[PDB]
């Protein structure tokens with residue numbers, strides 16, 4: 001396999017309100033880094049420690065937890081390079097789910 | 106620039122800062138493997154919700170709420186020209202990363 005490859009950055013496209021409607025709702029935080037491509041990554045932060053019940057109240061017996069995705073990004077290498085990068089692997093929170101807590105004495 | 110160089114020797118970045126949700130969730134899911142030799146990454150894991158409803162306190166399915174996949178817009182590299190080992194174009198796809206439980210949209 002090659003160490004260095006060429007990439008054409010002219011993206012071709014190939015084929016919601018859940019953050020508010022979820023029992024483990026979240027808000028998005030925009031993370032911008034001019035040394036990275038994509039420069040913007042949107043990260044989810046859970047709104048509550050617990051989950052929302054049928055009445056609209058917080059149920060503390062369950063937990064809202066972020067679902068993290070491993071993703072690759074391009075980091076400019078050398079720094080500030082307009083046209084050369086290295087792949088970097090990061091973790092990004094993409095939303096939240098409601099889980100039963102882990103309990104131990 | 107239209108064309109850039111990319112070094113494929115990945116470096117991890119903070120993968121050990123805040124490092125079974127798919128099973129513990131009220132909207133559980135399983136991951137399915139999707140392989141495409143013309144794409145980089147060649148393997149993508151896609152979540153599929155286990156149920157239409159969500160799991161309640163009693164351990165039963167609550168049909169009044171819906172499990173939905175959280176889809177994320179992701180970029181991939183597609184070999185260009187086809188079968189090229191070292192040249193690609195970016196393409197945008199949607200990947201289901203996990204599931205959450207939502208109230209349904211209702212028309213009254």
Ligand SMILES: Cc1nonc1C(=O)N[C@H](c1nc(C[C@H]2CCc3ncc(Br)n3C2)n[nH]1)C1CCCCC1
Nearest residue numbers: 040041042070071072073092149178179180181182
């Ligand atoms: C997983 C997965 N399975 O297949 N490919 C990947 C994957 O990591 N692809 C990468 C990727 N795509 C994005 C779009 C971001 C849009 C904004 C955003 N906010 C939260 C997130 Br998560 N994102 C995602 N970033 N990095 C690209 C691979 C090749 C070089 C370019 C990057």
